[PDB]
Design a protein around this ligand. Sequence first.
Ligand SMILES: [Mg+2]
Ligand SMILES: [Mg+2]
Lengths: 137, 132
Amino acid sequence: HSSHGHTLLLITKPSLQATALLQHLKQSLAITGKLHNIQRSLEDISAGCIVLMDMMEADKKLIHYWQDNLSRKNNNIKTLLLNTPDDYPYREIENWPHINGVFYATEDQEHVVSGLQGILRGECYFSQKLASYLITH
Amino acid sequence: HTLLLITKPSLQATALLQHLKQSLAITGKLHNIQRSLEDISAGCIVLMDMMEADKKLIHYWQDNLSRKNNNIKTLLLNTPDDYPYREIENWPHINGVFYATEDQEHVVSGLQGILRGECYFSQKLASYLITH
Ligand SMILES: [Mg+2]
Ligand SMILES: [Mg+2]
């Protein structure tokens, strides 16, 4: 349960609803967090960051941009993909640096809280089939 | 009264809808801004997500919401804030405009005002609407 530790970085289109989701995750997880505009560059990324990368706001350019500059880091960070297309290819997921989970659900907040509680415990959030793909390799 | 959040479907949109439903004690639904809508029940409070609206979609939603059940209320969500007053005025059944993308409590308080029959406009925008 460390605060230094872990912090949420929600990278998406800034919106009232993104704020509502971030506040809900912060309160449910008892963690600090911030929202960052997916279309804006970032220089300062804290060490414990759990990046929630909004795939519905990402195109090929932004995927490349966020893959490129997050790989420069670590900095001990974890990337989880949010609002992920069904059938986003496994080959593409693997190419994300520091990839720790994939969220598909657009309706089940509780699903997502539970997954993030796992990440705080050192667990990834992958289906059995995707974890197997990633492990082997 | 029921909430009709018209936006791009996303986990965060569901999170906001749930928070508004729970804060206001009303039912609500999410509708994809890029899809047509047939039936709008009476007493709907439409939250129209301006960040997901381009000029074709504004024209579409202005057109079909002015048809289809004049017993509705429209509020603009995530409004750019230099959105022109004359544009706001052209929305049918316009009852409020939210600019804040960070202050949920502001917005809840505004929607509880709308439920009491109040509008949610800045003083200057209200003055513009009244004297038009
Ligand atoms: Mg849809
Ligand atoms: Mg406001």
